[PDB]
Amino acid sequence: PQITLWKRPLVTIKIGGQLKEALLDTGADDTVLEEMNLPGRWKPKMIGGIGGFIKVRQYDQILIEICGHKAIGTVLVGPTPVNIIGRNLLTQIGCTLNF
Amino acid sequence: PQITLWKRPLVTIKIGGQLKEALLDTGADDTVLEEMNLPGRWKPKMIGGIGGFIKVRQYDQILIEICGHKAIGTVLVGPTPVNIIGRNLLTQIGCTLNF
């Protein structure tokens, strides 16, 4: 699809069989989801945003569908204001910026 | 242009004379630049994201050039870790996400 930016680029994703809403975010290196449960072990990661740094849980090789496109990669879990799909998964679905 | 997302989408902008580097950020409602002086009156605003909130100064009707595309809109100035071009100006240059 082609997504314009007059409104927030919010799309439906699916993870662990559950639908969630997430922001397609080209300003994010990584994908960060709100508190939820994921399989397997996690390791620590510190990430920085507009207001400073937070600690998040890093889960690797996680299955996630974004607008019907399948991706498998790293998903961070923590106190983000909104679920965000970062460049690590945007590249997997073939997403580009165009003007 | 078409910009892939293997790396951060950094571009050159021109504002208030100054040439600056900035990140094309589809997850940002607003454009936020590092501390600088801009012409006109301003009012304070709080903006939030990962890490919480920061206080910024809001300037309206500011002219910017992004990759040589002229765009006018609100520009926020404050202690952002990186210069961000948000949706309010991305729309003006006809920027879209495509996959």
Binding site: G48, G49 | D25, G49
Partner: peptide, 6 residues
Amino acid sequence: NLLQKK
């Protein structure tokens, strides 16, 4: 304003 960096 959801810029995020490692």
